[PDB]
C-alpha cells in the first residue's frame, strides 16, 4: 500500500505546488 | 605543518558539506520555504524532463519554480522562465532579518554550449510584509556575474529599523543574452531569526 | 610538502566521496535495506505541508520512515515520529555480524529553527532474529551528542560469540528537548557479511 | 391601463430571463470565459477529504473557482478561498473595453447560517495585458453591500483612453466577517468589444 | 385594481415557471425525447467546453446534439453543426398529433459579438413514421427571425387525416450569416397525444 | 399606480428568484443536505433509458434519490421509487427546529403522459435522532394535492417543546394512482437553526 | 460507492448518447 | 490428364487462398477500411453486461461493428444489431468505382441453433459523398439467400457515369426471421480505384 | 483503496 | 480415376492445411521464434492499426516486426520499415542447419493499388553464431519476384562444414519501388535440427 | 470427367471451409462455449516466454485453457497442463445430446521439436449435470493416435436413453511421452440440441 | 479475474516484445 | 605556504563540485541526453516482480537504463543487464566531436557483497549517425579496471577527420566475473560541440 | 468494484 | 488486484 502511494507520489511531486502553513519537522 | 594541513583540509570539507556555505537557507523548500506560484512570472514551456513509471516513459514536462529552492544543480535542474525578465516570490521558513542572498548557476565548464547565456544577470530583492503587498522594501540591487564563481553571495542592504520579513521577491531584469528564456538554478536567503 | 598536501587533500576527498565513511551501509535502501513499517513508531501527523494541484488542495505531505535509510540530509529530509521516544525497525540487505552504527543529523548551523532539539539523544540498537521478536539482543546503548559532529559513529558491543542479524531495531529513548516530535535524518548499519 | 400593467410585467420578465441584466457577461464560462486557475488564490481547504487512496486522504476542497463564472447560485455553489483576502483571474471571451461588473451573493434569507458573513466586502477590479503581469490597471474600487440586493452592479472607472482588456483580476480585500473563508457565487464582466 | 395587478403578475410568473410556455415539450430529453444521433448532420469541432474532475481540468470537448433538447440556454449551451445547413432527428416521448414547434436562441443583447449570425434562419419540420423512413411528411416551413424574440413558436400545418408521429426531423437550410457553423440552442415539439 | 405596479412586479420577481419561497432549505444538497441512501426505498428498475458510447450499449440510466434535494424540476428530473408507497431519509445541513416542509411536482400541463398519477399523495414527515431510529417523532401528516399548485407547503405540528433534528424521514403512504412507481421531484425542509 | 459512480457518470454524460426505448418515469 | 487434375486443384486452392475471391476488398479493416461507428445502427443489447463498476453493470454487447470488416467468420464473430433493419457505414481504403459486393454468413451446418434466421435477407448498398449525407446513391438492391452458399457476391448497378465513392452504406431491410437481432459476419466492397 | 469519504461537515455557503 | 482424383484433392488440401508447406518454420513466434527487436531497422510510423477496448476506439498504432513471424497475411498484416533497405534478426526455436527460407507477400490481385511496390525485392540471409556477432555467414542472396507467386521459397547455400545456427539475419537491400517504406508480411526459416 | 473433377474439388474445399468437418462445435468459445477454469488441471508454469515493454521485463506469457476452444492450431497455440495426465471442463453453448468429439494436434511435420510427444494419448469424455459433479456419465474412452491424422474424430457411446448435457469433462489419462507437460490444441463437442 | 487479465493482455500484446529463453510448450 | 595549502584545497574542492571532472557530460539526462531504450539490451529480470495485477506478477526489474545517465551512484543505483555482454544507446545533448568517456562504478569498500564482480570490464564506444545504424564507428576500446578508482576516464581514438556524433553506443564485452548480470552506474560522454 | 460478470447466455451467432 | 509484492531478495548492486 505504501509502495503504491510512494510511486503515485513520485508521479505527482513535480506537478503539485507545496505551501508550508507552518514549519515542517526539521 | 602536517597536522595543520589536515586541519585546513577537514575544515574546508566540513564547510563544503554544510550546503557549501555553513548558513541556514530560509528559502530552502524541504526546510519550510515555499514558492508562491501565483506570484511567479511565466514558465518557459520546454517539455525537456522525462517522467517515467516502472521504467516506462510516459511524457515530457517543464521544471516548475519549486526547483529554485531545491538543492540539486546539475545542468537542467533549473526553472526556465520566459524571456529575460521575470520574478519569483518565496515565503521563508522563519521571520528573519535578511542579511544576504545566494544565487547559483552551473559553471561554464559544465554547460553544453560553452556559455551560460541563460543565466540571470541584473536582479533585485524586495522584502514583503504580507503576500498581497504590491510595493515591497528594496533589500538590494545586484548582478550575477557570468565570469565569476558558480555560487555567488550578495549582501543585503541593512536599514536602521528592525523590520523582519518572511516573504521575499526576487526580480530578474536581464539575463546573459539568451533570446528565449532565463534559467534559475537555486536562490537562497540568509539572515537572523527574530 | 606540496605533493604531500595534494595526497592529503585527495585522500580526504576520496573518503568523503565514499558515503563519507568508506564502509558498507547494510541498511541503505538502494542497496537492499528496507523499513518494516508496521514495527515503527507512529509518524508525527501535521497538516502544514499542503500539496495542491491547479490550486486545489490535494494532500498533506509528511515524510515516511524510508527516508531514514536514504542519503539526502538537507533540513527536513528526515522522518519525524510522534513524541520524544520511539523506534524504527530495519531489514538489512544481507545477514551480517553488526560491528558499528552511524547516526547523522543536520548541524545546528543549518537548522532554520536555530537548534536541533528534535535530534535523537539516548538510543540503543538491538538485533532481531525475525520480524516478530519484541526486544532482541542488545547490540549497544549510546547517546547522539548534539554538540558533536553531524555524523557520529558508534561501536557495537563485543560479545564472546558473533551472532549474525538481518533485522535491527533502533530504539530512541529520548530526544534533545523538542516538545512534539523527534527527527531521524539517517541511520546506517556496518559490519561483516556471513 | 390593464395593457400597461401587462407591459410592465412582460418587460420585467423579459429582462429577468436575459440573465437578470440584459447585458453580455464576457466572463461567463459557457460563453467563452475561463478561470486562469494557476493565477488564482488557493481554494479553501475543507476539514475532511473527498476520498482516500492507498490509505491517504485526497481532495480537501468543496468547489473549484470555475463556479464563479457559472450562473447557478443556490447556496454552496460558490468558490471559497482561505481567509478574507484573495484574487481570481479571468480570461474574457473577447477583448473588450470593460464598462461594468456584477457580483452576486445568496441573500441572507437563504443562508443556512442566518448570515452572509462570508460574502466579499471591499474589492477592486484590474485589467491585465497578460496573466503574468504583476501590477494591473485599476478598473475600479467597490464594496459589496451585505444589506443590498443579491445582485449588485458596479461602474468601471471612466477612462480618457480606450485600452481593451481580455484578462481581468478580481481582488477581494475583505469579507463581511467570516473568520475562515470568503465565498464568491458569481462575478460578471460587461463592456463593449473592440 | 391592486388585487387584479397581483393576479396579472402571478399569472405571468406561473406561465414563466412552466417552461415559459405552459405546454408539454415532447422532444425534451429528460421527459423521454431522444436524439437519433446517427441521423444528425456533422457537429462542428469546437472543443470549447472544459471537462474537469475534482477541480482538475482534463480536456476540451464540443457539445452534442443532445443539448438541443435540454433546457439550459445560456450562451454556448447549443449544438454547433458544421456550415449553414444541417438536420437533426428526434424521437418524441409520445405518439402525438404535432401542433407547434418552438425554437430558442440567445437574444442579441447576450451575444458577445453583438449579433447572432450563427442562429438558424430557414428551416422545415417533417413527421417520420419510423426511424428508417427517408421521405417524411412536411409539417411546416419557417424562418427563425433574428430580429424577433429569443423564443419563437411556429404553427404546424394541420392536415385532415389524423396521422400521428413519434419521430420529427428538423431541417435547417440557412443561418444568419456565420460562415463556419450554426448554433441550435433548443428545439421543442408540442401537440396532442393520441 | 404605475410605481406601485413596478413595486409589485419587482417584489414578486425577487421572491421568485429566492428559490420561489425566500426560506432556507436545510435539505438542499448543495448547501450541505444529503440522502441516507441505505434508508431509502428501492429505486424503480427500468432498462429503458440506454446510454451508449460509439454505438456500444453501456449502461441503463435511472435517477438516484439525490435528485430529490436538487432544484431542477423539468419532467423526469425526479427520483422514481418502486410501487406506490415508500420513504426517503434526508440528513439536513444543520440541526434545526423543523417548522415547515415543501413538496414540488411538475404541473399536469407539462407532463408528457397527460397526468401526474405518479405524484406523491398521502405522506408524513418524522424527525430522527440518529440514522438507526425506525419511526422517530411525527412532525406532520399531509396530502400533496394533484389539483393544487406545483409547489405546496405544509406546516409542521406545534409541540409544547421544540425538539431539534438533523435527520428527517419522508414517508410516502400513497401516490396518485400510477401502477408502477412514485416520482419525487423536490422535498425541502424549513425551520430554525439551534 | 455511489459517490464514485456519480462522478464517473458526470465524466461520461456529455459523450454518451441516450435512447429512450419507452417513457422514463416522470 | 493427371496433370490437368492437379492444375484444377491448384487453381481452386490458389483462389481459395486469395481471400476466397481473388479480388481486392476495399472495406477490409487491415487493408485500410474502417467502420464509421457513429453513423451505424446501435449494436444489439445483450441481456447481461460484461462487467460491473461501483455496483453498476457495464457493456451490454457482444461484438462491435468492426468485426464486419474482419475475415474471421467462426460462429459468433459477427456484429448483431437490434431487430431486422439496420445500417453500417464503411470508409473504404481508396476512392473507387464500386463493381461488386460480398456478404458472408455462417452456413446452417455450423449454426448451433440449427438455423440462420438471424442472417440478413433484403439489403441495398449506397455510395455516399460524405458520411453525413442523408440520402446516398443506390448502388444496388439484393437478397442474401439463406439457401445459397455461405459467401454470396452481388453485382453493382451498371452506371452510365463514373462517380467514385470512398464511403458506402449497407442498409439491411429484413432478416431471415430472427425476432431479436440480425447478425453480419462479413461485408466486402470490390471495384476499380480511380 | 479508492475509498470515498463522507464529510459530515457542511460545505462553505 | 475417381478415387485417384479424390486422392490428389485430399493430398493438396492436407499440404495446404500444414502451413501451406508441410515444413517446420523455426522462425514462427508461437513455436518459439523471437524477433531481436534491438537488431531490426526502423519501423515506418504508419499509425494505421486501430486498438479498441469494449468496442471503444482508443488509438492508432503501427505494426511491429513481430508480425513478420506471425501467420496472418491479409493486406496490412505486415511490418512496414522505413525506406527501401532494412534488416531483421530472428532467434530460431531450435539450433538447425538452415536449408531454405520462405517469403510471403500479398498477391497483386488483393492489393488496393493494383501493385505491390512495397514488397521486398533483393535480400540476403546470414547465419549468426550469437546475438552480438556483427559479421555473419552468408546463407544466400535472393530476389522476391513481384511477378511470381505470393509464397516464394529460397534455397540456402549449403557449405561442407556442419555449422548450425539459431540466429538468422534477414537483410533487405531494395523494394519494388515504394518511395516511403517496405512491407514484410511473413519470413520463415526451414532446416534440420541438430 | 473435367466437370466431375471440379465438383470433387469444390466439394472438398467447401467441407474444408466449414471448420474442416461441417458440424456444429458446441464447445467453440466464439459460439458460446466456455472453460470452467477452476475445474481444470494446473497450467504448466514456465518463465521462458518473457514479455517486455521498452526493454523492461513485464510478465511471463503462458497460454490459458481457453485456447483449447479456439480454432487457431499453429504450433504453440495450445494449452499446456502440468504433467502427463489432467483434465479440462467445458461448458457448452447449448444443452445437447453429445454424439461425437474431435481432438486436433499439430502434425509432426510441423513440430519444431521433431515429435509430438506432448500430444494427448488416452482420454475419456464425461457428461456433467452441474459444475460440482466429480465423475459424471462416461460418454466414451478413446486414444488420440500420434501416427494418425492431425484431426481425429471419436463417436460417443450409444446409450438406451439420450441424456443431454451442457457440461463435459475431458479427462486426459496419458500423453505421448513428454516428461513435463501435455499440450491440447483444440477439443470440439458435436451432437444434437434438445 | 481472468477476463480482466485477458482483456489487459489484448491491449498489451502488440506493444510488448516477446523473447523466448527456451522453447515454449508445443 | 598556508595560502598555498588553502589554494590546493580550494582547487580540489572546486573540481570536485564540478561533477568531479570539470567537463561537460553530453550524455547527462538532465542536461539533454537520453537513453534510446528500444535499442538497448534487455534489462536484467529479477527473480520476483514488483506487483501483481489480476493474479499476474508484473515488472521483474530493478532500475531502468535511465539511471546510467543520472549522477547518483549509491549502491544499487545502476542499470543491470543480463549476462556479461550488452549495449546501451545514448542520444547526446548536442552534436559533438567526442574526446573522452567516463565510467563510474561503486568502490569495493561500499559493495555489500564484498566485490564488484558485476562491474563492466572490456568495453568499446561507437559513434552512430542514427540509432538504427547496424555498424557504428569505433571511438575506442577500453577496460574498466576493478583495481582502479571508482571514476575512470578513457581517451577517444585520435582521428584524422572530424565527423561529429549525437548518438553513441556503449558496448560491454565482459564483466568482472558476476555470473548473472552486469551493473552500470554512470556513463559520460565528453568532447567539443560543432 | 471492477467485477467481471459471466453472461451464462449464448452470444448472437 | 493491484497488489504490491515485497522482493525479499537484494537488488543488483
Ligand atoms: Cl505524504
Ligand atoms: Cl444510472
Ligand atoms: Cl500469460
Ligand atoms: K535547483
Ligand atoms: K534522509
Ligand atoms: K456560481
Ligand atoms: K440547450
Ligand atoms: K429535482
Ligand atoms: K467477421
Ligand atoms: K504476418
Ligand atoms: K487452439
Ligand atoms: K546512476
Residue numbers in the entry:
A (entry chain D), G (entry chain D), L (entry chain D): 530 to 555
B (entry chain C), C (entry chain A), D (entry chain B), E (entry chain C), F (entry chain A), H (entry chain B), ...: 618 to 811
I (entry chain E), N (entry chain E), O (entry chain E): 543 to 555
What do the authors of the reporting publication say about this deposited model?
The Linker of Nucleoskeleton and Cytoskeleton (LINC) complex crosses both inner and outer nuclear membranes of the nuclear envelope to mechanically transduce cytoskeletal forces to nuclear contents. It is formed of nuclear SUN (Sad1 and UNC84 homology) and cytoplasmic KASH (Klarsicht, ANC-1, and Syne homology) proteins, which interact within the nuclear lumen. JAW1/LRMP (lymphoid restricted membrane protein) is an atypical KASH protein that is localised in the endoplasmic reticulum and outer nuclear membrane, and is specifically expressed in certain cells of the immune system, small intestine, pancreas and taste buds. Here, we report the crystal structure of the SUN-KASH complex between SUN1 and the non-canonical KASH domain of JAW1/LRMP (herein referred to as KASH6).
Thus, we crystallised the SUN1-KASH6 complex and solved its X-ray crystal structures from several crystals at resolutions between 1.7 and 2.3 Å. In contrast with previous SUN-KASH 6:6 structures, the SUN1-KASH6 crystal structure contains nine SUN domains, such that head-to-head interfaces of three SUN1 trimers interact together around a three-fold symmetry axis in a ‘trimer-of-trimers’ configuration. KASH6 peptides are clearly bound at both of these KASH-binding pockets of each SUN1 trimer (these are herein referred to as KASH6α and KASH6β). The third KASH-binding pocket of each SUN1 trimer is located on the underside of the trimer-of-trimers structure, away from inter-trimer interfaces. Here, we observed poor peptide electron density in the 1.7 Å resolution structure, and could build only three C-terminal KASH6 amino-acids (herein referred to as KASH6γ), with 71% occupancy. At the remaining KASH6γ/unbound site, KASH-lidγ adopts a low angled conformation in which its β-structure follows the path that would normally be occupied by the KASH peptide. This localisation likely acts as a steric hindrance for KASH-binding. As the only remaining binding interface is the minimal binding pocket for the KASH peptide C-terminus, this likely substantially reduces the binding affinity, accounting for the lack of stable binding by a third KASH6 peptide. Hence, treatment at pH 5.0 triggers the conformational change of SUN1-KASH6 from a symmetric head-to-head 6:6 structure into an asymmetric trimer-of-trimers 9:6 assembly. This conformational change requires the dissociation of two KASH6 molecules from each 6:6 complex. Hence, the few amino-acids of a KASH6γ peptide observed in the 1.7 Å crystal structure were likely remnants of the peptide having failed to fully dissociate upon trimer-of-trimers assembly.
